[PDB]
Design a protein around this ligand. Structure first.
Ligand SMILES: CCc1c(-c2csc(N3CCNC[C@@H]3C(=O)NCCCCO)n2)[nH]c(C)c1C(C)=O
Ligand SMILES: [Mg+2]
Length: 103
């Protein structure tokens, strides 16, 4: 049940990644017009860190579900050629590759 250890490794690496800047904190819907209306389930790296710190993950699969939610939301709201969108593609490819070179 120490897939949570690899969750720790991968989350540390995403948190320190250069392209992680759009995802370190929750999006503030007061500052982003339309975000609340379009994104039903917001997610971000600090929320995953908090959930992991309090033992809120029962398996690596739901951790991965939150991670993929970050980048699904990113691609849903932001254009692929937007700055946040580009960072999201870099981060998504990073997560998929790291997650697969363990499982
Ligand atoms: C595009 C908003 C965004 C971010 C995000 C996090 S910091 C940031 N920066 C700050 C400095 N340069 C401009 C840009 C910005 O516009 N900051 C105001 C909005 C911050 C509300 O929290 N952008 N991350 C995701 C997943 C986003 C969206 C819309 O999906
Ligand atoms: Mg693939």
């Amino acid at each position: 049940h120490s897939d949570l250890t690899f969750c720790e490794i991968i989350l540390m690496e995403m948190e320190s990644h250069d392209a992680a800047w759009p995802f370190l904190e929750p999006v503030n819907p007061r500052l982003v017009s339309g975000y609340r209306r379009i994104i039903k389930n917001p997610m971000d790296f600090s929320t995953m860190r908090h959930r992991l710190s309090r033992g809120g993950y029962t398996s690596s699969e739901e951790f991965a579900a939150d991670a993929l939610l970050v980048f699904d939301n990113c691609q849903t709201f932001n254009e692929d050629d937007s700055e946040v969108g580009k960072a999201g593609h870099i981060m998504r490819r990073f997560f998929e590759s790291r997650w697969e070179e363990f499982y």
